[PDB]
Amino acid sequence: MKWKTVSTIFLVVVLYLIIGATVFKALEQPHEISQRTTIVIQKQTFISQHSCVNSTELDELIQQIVAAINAGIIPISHWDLGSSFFFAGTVITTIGFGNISPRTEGGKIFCIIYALLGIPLFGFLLAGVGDQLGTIFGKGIAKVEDTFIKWNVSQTKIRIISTIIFILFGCVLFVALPAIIFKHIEGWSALDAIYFVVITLTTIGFGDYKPVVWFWILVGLAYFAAVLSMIGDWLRVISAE
Amino acid sequence: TINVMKWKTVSTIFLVVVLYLIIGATVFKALEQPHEISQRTTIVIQKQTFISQHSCVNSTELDELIQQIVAAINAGIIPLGNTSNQISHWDLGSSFFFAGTVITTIGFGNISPRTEGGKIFCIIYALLGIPLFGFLLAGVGDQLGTIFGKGIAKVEDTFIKWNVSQTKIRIISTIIFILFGCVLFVALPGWSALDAIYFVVITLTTIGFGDYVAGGSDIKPVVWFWILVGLAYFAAVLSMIGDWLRVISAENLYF
Ligand SMILES: CCCCCCC(CCCCCC)(CO[C@H]1O[C@@H](CO)[C@H](O)[C@@H](O)[C@@H]1O)CO[C@H]1O[C@@H](CO)[C@H](O)[C@@H](O)[C@@H]1O
Ligand SMILES: CCCCCCC(CCCCCC)(CO[C@H]1O[C@@H](CO)[C@H](O)[C@@H](O)[C@@H]1O)CO[C@H]1O[C@@H](CO)[C@H](O)[C@@H](O)[C@@H]1O
Ligand SMILES: *[C@@H]1O[C@H](CO)[C@@H](O)[C@H](O)[C@H]1NC(C)=O
Ligand SMILES: [K+]
Ligand SMILES: [K+]
Numbered sequence: 001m002k003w004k005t006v007s008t009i010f011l012v013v014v015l016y017l018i019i020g021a022t023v024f025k026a027l028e029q030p031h032e033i034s035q036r037t038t039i040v041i042q043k044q045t046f047i048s049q050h051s052c053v054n055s056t057e058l059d060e061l062i063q064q065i066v067a068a069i070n071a072g073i074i075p076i077s078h079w080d081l082g083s084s085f086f087f088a089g090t091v092i093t094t095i096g097f098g099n100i101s102p103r104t105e106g107g108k109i110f111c112i113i114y115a116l117l118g119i120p121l122f123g124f125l126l127a128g129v130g131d132q133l134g135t136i137f138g139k140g141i142a143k144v145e146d147t148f149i150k151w152n153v154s155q156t157k158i159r160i161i162s163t164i165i166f167i168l169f170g171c172v173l174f175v176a177l178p179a180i181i182f183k184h185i186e187g188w189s190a191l192d193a194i195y196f197v198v199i200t201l202t203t204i205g206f207g208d209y210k211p212v213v214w215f216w217i218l219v220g221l222a223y224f225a226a227v228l229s230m231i232g233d234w235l236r237v238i239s240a241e
Numbered sequence: 242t243i244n245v246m247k248w249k250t251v252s253t254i255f256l257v258v259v260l261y262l263i264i265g266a267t268v269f270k271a272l273e274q275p276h277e278i279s280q281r282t283t284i285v286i287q288k289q290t291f292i293s294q295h296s297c298v299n300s301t302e303l304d305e306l307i308q309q310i311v312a313a314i315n316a317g318i319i320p321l322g323n324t325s326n327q328i329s330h331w332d333l334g335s336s337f338f339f340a341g342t343v344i345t346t347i348g349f350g351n352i353s354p355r356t357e358g359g360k361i362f363c364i365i366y367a368l369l370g371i372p373l374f375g376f377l378l379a380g381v382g383d384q385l386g387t388i389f390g391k392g393i394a395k396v397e398d399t400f401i402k403w404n405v406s407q408t409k410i411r412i413i414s415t416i417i418f419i420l421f422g423c424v425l426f427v428a429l430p431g432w433s434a435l436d437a438i439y440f441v442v443i444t445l446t447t448i449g450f451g452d453y454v455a456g457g458s459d460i461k462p463v464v465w466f467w468i469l470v471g472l473a474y475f476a477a478v479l480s481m482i483g484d485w486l487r488v489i490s491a492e493n494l495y496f
C-alpha cells in the first residue's frame with residue numbers, strides 16, 4: 001500500500017471518529033444528565049425510607065463497593081472452574097472483560113502468555129470454522145445458481161438472492177434467536193439483545209454479564225468475520241470509485 | 242482428498258482449543274480464586290456490620306441497594322454525592338475516545354451507549370468502522386514492514402560478509418523484532434513493570450484494558466502513533482505465532 005493511500009485512510013478514520021464523537025454526545029449526554037437526577041432521587045428515597053442511615057454513611061457504603069469492584073469482585077463466584085473457562089474464552093476470542101480480570105502477579109503473567117499463544121490458536125480454529133461453513137454455504141448457493149441459470153435469470157438477479165440467503169441466516173441465529181432467549185432470561189428488548197450480540201461477535205465486548213452455546217459463539221464469530229470482510233470489500237469499491 | 246485433510250485439521254485444532262481452555266480454567270482458578278475468597282469475606286463482614294449498625298435496614302433491602310449502586314458504577318457514574326464530582330463519559334473528547342475503542346474492537350469495559358438511538362448508531366458505526374479501521378491498520382503494517390524490511394536487509398548483508406549461517410541470521414532478526422517491542426511498547430510508555438506490560442499486551446491484542454478503575458478512567462500525536470504502531474506490531478506478532486501453529490499442526494497431521 002502507497003503512503004498517499006495510508007494518509008487518506010488516516011484522514012477518513014479521524015473524520016469518522018469526529019462524526020462518532022458528535023453523534024454519541026448528542027444521543028448519550030442528555031440521558032446521562034437525567035440519570036444523575038434518577039440516582040439523587042433514589043438516594044434521597046432510601047434515606048427517607050431508612051431514617052437510621054444518613055447520607056455520609058450511605059456514601060461510606062458506596063465507596064466500599066467501589067473498593068470491592070476495584071479489587072475485582074462484584075458484590076456467585078468469578079474464579080470457579082466454569083467461570084474461569086468463560087474468562088479464558090474471552091481472552092483468546094479478544095472479546096475481553098469489564099472489571100473481572102486477574103489481580104494477582106501470577107494471574108497477570110499467565111494471562112500475557114495465555115493471550116499471546118491462545119489468540120493465534122483461536123484464530124486458527126475460527127479460520128477453519130469459516131472455511132467449513134463457507135464450503136457448506138457455497139455448495140447450497142451452487143444448487144440455487146444452477147436452478148436459476150437453467151430457467152434463464154440474469155447474474156445480477158442471481159447474486160441479489162444469494163445476499164438475501166446470507167442476511168436471513170444471520171437474522172435467524174443472531175437477530176431473532178437471541179431476541180427470544182434474552183427476552184425470556186433477562187427480559188431485554190429486541191434492540192438490547194441485538195446490541196449485546198453485535199458487540200460480542202465483533203469482539204468489542206459487553207464488559208461484565210453448553211455444546212449449542214459454544215457452537216453458536218463459534219458460528220457467530222465466523223459469520224461476523226465474513227460480514228465485516230464483505231463490508232471491507234464494499235469499501236474497496238467506494239475507494240476505487 | 243484435500244477436503245478430508247481440511248476437516249481433520251479443524252477437528253484436532255477444536256480439541257486443542259477445548260484442552261487449552263480446560264488448562265486456562267484450571268490455572269486461572271488456582272491463581273485467582275484464593276484472592277477472590279479473601280476479598281469476599283471482607284465484603285460479607287462489612288455488609289453484616291452495616292445491617293448490625295443500621296437496624297431499620299434488612300439483608301433483602303441492602304442486596305437490592307447494592308445492585309443499583311453497581312449498576313450506576315458500571316454505567317460510569319459512581320453515586321457520590323449529588324454525582325456533581327463524576328466526570329461525564331459522553332462529552333466530545335470522551336465520545337471520540339469511545340468511538341476509537343469501538344472501531345479498534347478494544348472496547349471500554351462496562352461503558353456503553355444506554356439509549357435506543359445510541360445502541361442503533363453503535364451497531365451501524367461498529368459494522369462500518371471496524372472494516373474501515375482495519376484498512377488503516379493494514380496500511381500502517383505495510384509501511385512498518387517496508388521500514389523494518391530495509392533495516393533487516395542491511396543487518397543480513399552485514400552478517401553475510403561476516404561468514405554467519407542463515408540459521409543464526411534468522412535467529413538474530415527475531416531478537417531485533419522482539420527488542421523492537423520491548424523498547425517502543427514496554428520501555429517507552431505508581432504502577433509496576435508487570436502492570437505496564439500487562440496493560441500494553443491486553444490493550445494492543447484488542448482484549449481491552451476493560452475498566453481499570455470503577456466507573457471508567459480519566460483523560461495526542463505521539464499517543465496516536467504509539468497506538469497505531471502498537472496494534473500493527475501486535476498484529477504481526479500474533480500472525481507469526483499463527484504461522485508457527487500451522488507448521489506444528491501440519492507436522493502432526495502429515496507426519
Ligand atoms: C448516570 C448513569 C447511571 C444510571 C443508573 C440508573 C439506575 C440505578 C440508580 C440507583 C442509584 C443508587 C445509589 C436506575 O435504577 C433503576 O434500575 C432498574 C433496574 O435495576 C429498576 O427497574 C428501576 O426501578 C430503577 O429505578 C440503574 O438503572 C439501569 O439498570 C439497568 C440494569 O441494572 C438497566 O439495563 C437500565 O435500563 C437501567 O437504566
Ligand atoms: C510492525 C512491524 C512489522 C514488520 C513486518 C516485516 C516482514 C515480516 C516479519 C519479519 C520478522 C523478522 C524476525 C514483512 O511482513 C509483511 O510485510 C507486508 C509489506 O510491508 C506484506 O504485505 C505482508 O504480506 C508481510 O507479511 C518482512 O520482513 C522481511 O523483510 C525482508 C526485506 O528484504 C527481509 O529479507 C526478511 O529477512 C524480513 O523477514
Ligand atoms: C450522620 O451524619 C453526621 C454528619 O456527617 C455524622 O457525624 C454522623 O455520625 C452520621 N450518623 C451516623 C449514625 O454515623
Ligand atoms: K474487546
Ligand atoms: K477485540
Ligand SMILES: [K+]
Pocket residue numbers: 095096097098204205207347348349350448449450451
Ligand atoms: K472491553
Ligand SMILES: [Mg+2]
Pocket residue numbers: 317318319327328330455456457458
Ligand atoms: Mg466515571
